[PDB]
Amino acid sequence: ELKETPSQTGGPYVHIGLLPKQANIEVFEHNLDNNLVQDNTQGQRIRLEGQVFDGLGLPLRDVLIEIWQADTNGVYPSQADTQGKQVDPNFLGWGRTGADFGTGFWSFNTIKPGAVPGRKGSTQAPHISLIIFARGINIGLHTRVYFDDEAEANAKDPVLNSIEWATRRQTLVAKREERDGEVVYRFDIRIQGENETVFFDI
Amino acid sequence: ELKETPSQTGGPYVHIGLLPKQANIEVFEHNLDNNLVQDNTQGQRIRLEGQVFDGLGLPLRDVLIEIWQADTNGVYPSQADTQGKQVDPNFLGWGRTGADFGTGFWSFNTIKPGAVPGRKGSTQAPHISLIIFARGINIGLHTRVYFDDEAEANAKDPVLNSIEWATRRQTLVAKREERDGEVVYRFDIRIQGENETVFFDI
Amino acid sequence: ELKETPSQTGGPYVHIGLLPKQANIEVFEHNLDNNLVQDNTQGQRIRLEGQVFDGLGLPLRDVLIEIWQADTNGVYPSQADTQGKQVDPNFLGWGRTGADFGTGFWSFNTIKPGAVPGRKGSTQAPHISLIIFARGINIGLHTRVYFDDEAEANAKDPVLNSIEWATRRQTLVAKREERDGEVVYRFDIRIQGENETVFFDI
Amino acid sequence: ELKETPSQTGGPYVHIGLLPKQANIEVFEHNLDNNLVQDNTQGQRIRLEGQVFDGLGLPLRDVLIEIWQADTNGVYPSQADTQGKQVDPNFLGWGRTGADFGTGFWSFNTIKPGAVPGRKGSTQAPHISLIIFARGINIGLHTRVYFDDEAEANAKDPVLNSIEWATRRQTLVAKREERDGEVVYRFDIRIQGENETVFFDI
Amino acid sequence: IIWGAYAQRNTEDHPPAYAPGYKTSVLRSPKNALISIAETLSEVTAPHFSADKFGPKDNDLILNYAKDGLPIGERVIVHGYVRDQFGRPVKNALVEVWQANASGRYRHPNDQYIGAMDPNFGGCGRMLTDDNGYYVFRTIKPGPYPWRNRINEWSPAHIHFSLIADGWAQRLISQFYFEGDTLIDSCPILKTIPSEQQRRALIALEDKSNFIEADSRCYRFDITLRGRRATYFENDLT
Amino acid sequence: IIWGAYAQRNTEDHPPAYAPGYKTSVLRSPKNALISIAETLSEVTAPHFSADKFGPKDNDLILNYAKDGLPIGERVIVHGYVRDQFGRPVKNALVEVWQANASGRYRHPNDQYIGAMDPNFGGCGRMLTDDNGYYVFRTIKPGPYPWRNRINEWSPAHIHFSLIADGWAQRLISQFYFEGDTLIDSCPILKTIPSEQQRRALIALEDKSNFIEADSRCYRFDITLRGRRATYFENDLT
Amino acid sequence: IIWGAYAQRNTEDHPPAYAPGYKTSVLRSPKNALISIAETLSEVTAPHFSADKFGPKDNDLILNYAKDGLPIGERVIVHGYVRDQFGRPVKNALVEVWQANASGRYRHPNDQYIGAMDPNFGGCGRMLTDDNGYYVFRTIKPGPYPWRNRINEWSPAHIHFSLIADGWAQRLISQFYFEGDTLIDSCPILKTIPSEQQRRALIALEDKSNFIEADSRCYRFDITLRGRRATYFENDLT
Amino acid sequence: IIWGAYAQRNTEDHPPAYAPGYKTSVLRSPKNALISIAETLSEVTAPHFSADKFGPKDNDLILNYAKDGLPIGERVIVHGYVRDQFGRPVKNALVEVWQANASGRYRHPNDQYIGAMDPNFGGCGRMLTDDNGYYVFRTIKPGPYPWRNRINEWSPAHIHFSLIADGWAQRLISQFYFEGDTLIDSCPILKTIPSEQQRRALIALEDKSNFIEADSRCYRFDITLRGRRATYFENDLT
Ligand SMILES: [Fe+3]
Ligand SMILES: [Fe+3]
Ligand SMILES: [Fe+3]
Ligand SMILES: [Fe+3]
Ligand SMILES: [O-]
Ligand SMILES: [O-]
Ligand SMILES: [O-]
Ligand SMILES: [O-]
């Protein structure tokens, strides 16, 4: 048996290798990005945005974020999904973005995911899996984004219910807002301190 | 090559050896103290005072403080100053004091320093270098005292600008007050917790 | 990674195992030999012959020689040839012989090879690769036989031009002679001493 | 006690660092060279030239040569000369040159040296000390150049007489020639083989 | 074969989040312990990237940004295998890399180091591992560089890498170093890793038999990801 | 010679600020990492003290506070050399020392230990190192003493010292112990120092050839401060 | 997969040409260094031999020359695998062997040793390795024999072998010895090999589990040839 | 003090002239033994070079050939001391150096390696040691490079140097390598040196305390030349 290769921080320039356009490097013809909606993609379009804060309450302006999610019917565009259901064929389910160097805001254009089977016959509430990389972070931090308009499903969600300090479950619920026809979910992440966001070892 | 001798705390009685009069020991004829102004010393006389607080917000009543500064024209009374300018000949540039055992207040009578060259042609804002020793402190803590009436010079200061969390730069600015003809700068030091003072590895 | 098995001399009886008829042993029905020309083989028939001399200028009477060459169009009868051209189907490209025990003469009946691509778009002059085994020789000695009637191609040959002592390039050129209708190329090999034949590490 | 730093070959590019103009590099304002005659230098001007040959009798086209010699009165321009005589003040006594990349010829413009004291009251015949550096030469090779028109002094020279194989002493004698008013001494160096030049461990 | 969950990440084989010797970690590490959960389809699935989208020079950092000439520096090939902790090859994983040029300078707005920029070097590449888990890319060996942790801190030369493979749980970003670099023993970022054998798992080895004559040297570097266990009894994943 | 900056303090050769085994450090240590800066004239300059101000007995703790008789305890001479990390002598540095008497009792308002006070001992001294960096003082060997960290904590015998030398960056306060003291292996303040070789750098050694017959023993103790690097190219200090 | 050149032969893993302890090498070794060249199609190609031409007893030295009876001596099977230096099997390689009989006598005009000739033994064989690189042949274990280097020189028992494989560059002739033979430590031909680990690579090992009851013993002997590197960037071979 | 001759060069501490593993030495080494002689004024004298002729950037390979920008590569300072074998400093010795750029490419007509040329790097410098025998220069760390000895030979990174000091007998040319370079153990030119301790005398050491923050690393390299013996009885030199 082998031991996993150890993690090391992404460092301050994680953009060169992961978002070359943000670093103004044009080497690739196809670039990976924060837009998961293709023209024929099914579901309700939503915009997910927020900021990541350090222990002084200051936003990280060098953070890199990725999300992984199911399609509108809660099927993952992955060979490991064993549901036997057909997934939306115009959906990658993943995206990547970095925070603006000045303001610290980050965002994704995606679709609100459908509910996915939980373990042993349970049903999970709609959620987006999110990971954070940055200088100072030795191992990417995993979290989840749930939706405040899904109170009923959230209450029965297996993962939220496995967090014994109930007061912290709320750090994982994004707030719905309706900006000019666009349904936006605001999700701020607090790495340390009060209202520190729950992080998972998955 | 040799390794530096390791630091150890000053301990609770740092006064015996460094301020024998505060410990009521009269062994030396010449005693070092907190008065840097001699009769012919040039510049504006100022009084620098404050308290040092621990993590519970309580003042340290056993702390020893020293400051090191340039004269009124920003020249150091030291053979290592390479400015080629004549320094005020009635100025040691250094002093030492301890906090009052009851109240925790400390103070120095000195002169407001002139601006000193920074690296590579830059100019530093007027500042006083300060170090703190006490029981519980394993290595003397270095900080700097800048002046709130020097907003313009502070904004361009190289060292303050090298502190990336801008919110912490303010912990290094003392407040000017004019008490009965005396210009006093109040500088409180917070070792731990909110508004913790910036400390430097110099 | 493994290290190559080390070479050892062929020894004085290399004939038992490699040319059993020369040792008068009849064990094999099909015997490998020095005749590379089959009835339908294409190209000009040539005879290659010479002697191998030691440091005293005496011929080796126990040497075993093998040659490897391309067909008349410079294509090798080998799966590793990547030219995409069809090779002469009646051509093995290899042969083996030993020197006569009395005189030291050796010879092969073959075909003059066509020119073969060199590296990076270059063209090699016609050549035959040759290797020598014998008692006293710890590792088979590799050399090449070029032809004196190919002066123009030889002058542009990459391998001959990579021998910096130009005077030694000539040791690799065989002399054409026309004996009774037979075109013979005489190639003598001098292992040591003056006019020592160039040997390659390939 | 320390061991001398070990020698390593000069390598093929010894010119970059030692004769940058021959490598077409213009970095230095003052360049060291093969001309030891300044306008006021005393003595008879002579030109010293030759080629250096390897074991195949081929000239080295990448060799670097330096010579060290006394002035016209046999006094060295060196603080270690203990003769108590004044040396020619317009004489460095050293020069450096490389062989032409095409032909292999090298040359120096210098002065014929005067006789220098040998050990224990003896007198050495006029000579020039010479050292050779090149790819393939692991340690610079030291030799001496004596003059054929100094037969009488050569016969009594201590160093030539300490070479027990008398036949080899002649490899150290250069031949005088009078080319168009120029007195030239031809000195060829043979590193290996017949008439191999004597080399010294000094 | 019915797959179950990924084996648990061994926290002792990785750096801790809070490592005071790497100063930036002090305010960017959670004070609460991570909450471990039992895996679901969300953790064992991951996206798929098609090779069709990749350009011909995406794994050739020597040529992919070259404009007027070749970049300056040591030509090297880096190759190896990606496997899971049970030794199975990781096929079609997305490997992304990024690095500084031969001066130790990154082509990044925020890098003002005096080491010179190279107009013909970009410093990023990507590849998909093949069916044997094998990857290979070509680049210029990066130079070490100074950074401000303590004022005179210097990182040993390194190449940053990221992997997105079969399961989200396998997501990993790290960096590898080069055999023999003396700065490896002084780096506070590498010392965040608890054990010596894990520090060594980030060192790429000189692979002399694979050097290309008169052209390039070669380093061998293998990567191990978390692996899935197979299930033979109850399958609770769903 | 044009001097550049002091070499960086090696944080691994010193105690960390937060050391929970020394309880007082828990509320008196910063939670933020120190901010390292590039040095300026402020950090490479320091004050100068003239010998004229020093009294004849300032380095004689046996006599400088003696009123009716001599203090009680073991007569010892402590001497040694102050050098910078590059081996250069530190000339005219101010060395200040302070200690407890032979009972382990300090002449300090806040010290109520039952060990007896000595009316003829003060416990403080000072000296300037000479041109070779050499210093020498005479004193009474201090006794170890109890203090409250855990309730039964005992410090090994020690003499506190402070140095103000050529640059403010060199400012240092520490304490040295005496060869053989068994409490050295149990002290939580000495254990704040990470490495064994650095703990040993605080131990003064018996110097038997320098004992003075029928009079005093002698300990040898050298001190190393940070040193400046010389500059041969750009001088950015100013 | 596009193949590039064979890895360079490591001259330090082979005997030098001039080895004065093996006297015959003194006049049969070049005085000039070999000239190394970059490989071309000539060096990476080799002939192909078809199995159809091989007789049924070509790998059975016990039977292939037997006329009236069986040869006298120790019945042994020799088998093993041929691989390249990167561990890949060498398929369809021509392996030729030759040896002395049980007396140490060769069936060669030039061998006049008094050890007796065996009318039923020839001493030569050949085989093609299979797809796994495996070969197997049967023979009589050869006896050691005397030869004139120093007057009383004795070679340990050995079997000579030759390989023609995929590339001309791989061409190799050598000989293997038998585990335990005490003459192995005295042989000047084996001592021409510089390192002890390479001398050991010529020793065939007793393979007890593969002995055939009441019939034959068995030795295991593997052979490693030079291997080709794969190309992923420029292919300069042509 | 009256000086006598230089101590004899210890031939066992140097490579031999004939070293068949370095192929070029085969035809460029004498077959006769060198003839040792007793020294005369010719061998104990040497020329003197005045500092006045040296330009301000002669020891700054980073700037001395820079035209449009800075050269690409790792900024390093190399310094150390030149002493004779008896430990005395060698004052005012001419030290000349030359090297390849960061690609392993020399600015020489005969160098056609594909590693890129750097328009702002020349690769040569010179300095005179001071009165303490100290020297210091700044440069770009050279890259290793391939050359043809065996076809895939690679030299470890190195800087060539030459010294002309007080006596002609001291004349020396060699090259130094960098601590940790893995190619050091495979180089046939370095292996011409007989002993391991002498191979190590050519390795420059990382000097971390002398690194310049946010600017350059530093290597320490000392050089030892032959030394003269003093005479107290007969002086036969003349
Ligand atoms: Fe980096
Ligand atoms: Fe104390
Ligand atoms: Fe044999
Ligand atoms: Fe070189
Ligand atoms: O980085
Ligand atoms: O204390
Ligand atoms: O044999
Ligand atoms: O070189």
From Swiss-Prot, chains A, B, C, D:
Family named by the database record: Belongs to the intradiol ring-cleavage dioxygenase family.
Purpose: Plays an essential role in the utilization of numerous aromatic and hydroaromatic compounds via the beta-ketoadipate pathway.
Pathway: Aromatic compound metabolism; beta-ketoadipate pathway; 3-carboxy-cis,cis-muconate from 3,4-dihydroxybenzoate: step 1/1
UniProt keyword annotation of Iron present: yes
Catalytic activity: 3,4-dihydroxybenzoate + O2 = 3-carboxy-cis,cis-muconate + 2 H(+)
Binding site for 3,4-dihydroxybenzoate: 135
InterPro entries named among the record's database cross-references: Intradiol_dOase_C, Intradiol_dOase_core, Intradiol_RC_Dioxygenase, Protocat_dOase_a
Single GO molecular function: ferric iron binding
Keywords: Aromatic hydrocarbons catabolism, Dioxygenase, Iron, Oxidoreductase
Cofactor(s) needed: Fe(3+)
One record GO biological process: beta-ketoadipate pathway
Subunit structure, as described in the record: The enzyme is an oligomer of 12 copies of the alpha and beta chains.
Protein's name in the database: Protocatechuate 3,4-dioxygenase alpha chain
Cofactor notes: Binds Fe(3+) ion per subunit.
Record-linked NCBIfam families: protocat_alph
Enzyme class, broadest EC rank: oxidoreductase
EC number of the protein: 1.13.11.3
Swiss-Prot record, chains E, F, G, H:
Disulfide cross-links: none
InterPro entries: Intradiol_dOase_C, Intradiol_dOase_core, Intradiol_RC_Dioxygenase, PCDO_beta_N, Protocat_dOase_b
Transmembrane segments: none
Record EC number: 1.13.11.3
Pathway where it operates: Aromatic compound metabolism; beta-ketoadipate pathway; 3-carboxy-cis,cis-muconate from 3,4-dihydroxybenzoate: step 1/1
Pfam families assigned to the protein according to its UniProt record, in alphabetical order: Dioxygenase_C, PCDO_beta_N
Swiss-Prot/TrEMBL cofactor(s): Fe(3+)
Keywords: Aromatic hydrocarbons catabolism, Dioxygenase, Iron, Metal-binding, Oxidoreductase
CDD domains: 3_4-PCD_beta
Binding site for Fe cation: 106, 145, 158, 160
Catalysis performed (reactions): 3,4-dihydroxybenzoate + O2 = 3-carboxy-cis,cis-muconate + 2 H(+)
GO molecular function: ferric iron binding; protocatechuate 3,4-dioxygenase activity
Any single biological process term in GO: beta-ketoadipate pathway
UniProt remark on cofactor binding: Binds Fe(3+) ion per subunit.
Family named by the database record: Belongs to the intradiol ring-cleavage dioxygenase family.
PANTHER family: DIOXYGENASE, PUTATIVE (AFU_ORTHOLOGUE AFUA_2G02910)-RELATED (PTHR33711), INTRADIOL RING-CLEAVAGE DIOXYGENASES DOMAIN-CONTAINING PROTEIN (PTHR33711:SF10)
Subunit comment: The enzyme is an oligomer of 12 copies of the alpha and beta chains.
Task performed by this protein: Plays an essential role in the utilization of numerous aromatic and hydroaromatic compounds via the beta-ketoadipate pathway.
This protein's name: Protocatechuate 3,4-dioxygenase beta chain
Organism: Acinetobacter baylyi (strain ATCC 33305 / BD413 / ADP1)
